[PDB]
Assembly symmetry: C4
Homo-oligomer: 52 residues x 4
Amino acid sequence: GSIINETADDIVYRLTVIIDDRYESLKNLITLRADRLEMIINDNVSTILASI
Amino acid sequence: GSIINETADDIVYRLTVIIDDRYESLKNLITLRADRLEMIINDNVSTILASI
Amino acid sequence: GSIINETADDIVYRLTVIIDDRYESLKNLITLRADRLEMIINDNVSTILASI
Amino acid sequence: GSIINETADDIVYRLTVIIDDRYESLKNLITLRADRLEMIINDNVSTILASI
Ligand SMILES: c1ccc2ccccc2c1
Ligand SMILES: c1ccc2ccccc2c1
């Protein structure tokens, strides 16, 4: 439209990309560490149960 | 308000919607995974106690 | 005048509050769920050890 | 080179620095608390396994 609403759209867009990238990083990390805890807990409990 | 004041509110508002959405996502993911770990732990302890 | 400088300062300042508030919320949530899980584990292990 | 194009670059950069700072803190927090939980889980299981 004009010079103002475009410069605003550019600010919103660029920072949105930043926010989105940092979001995905945190999302994948949370997922990664939670999967590890599940794996470790499962393996250990299975070891305990296998040890009378 | 003035043009620039309305444009400032719009930039903040839009990026706040973004930040909030991403925050809720991580908030929900963290809660989901932690809740599941507690579910897994509580179940495993019940099995270990049943196996004496 | 200087309204563009001030508005940019005003924009950065407002979104900083948003970002920091959500950060603290996630920081406390992550910290809270970790304390809970550690407590649950320690409690359960003591229960298991009390049952030979 | 424009009046507001530099302003936009400043706003995005200034908030990017803040986002990066908070993102890194959560990343470190998530890593540290998960590393801690994994240690606690294994240390506890070693105790149980050592109790017939
Ligand atoms: C601390 C670190 C990582 C986690 C992942 C999922 C749920 C809770 C957590 C607590
Ligand atoms: C997504 C990405 C980074 C963030 C940093 C702080 C608070 C919320 C966030 C949401």
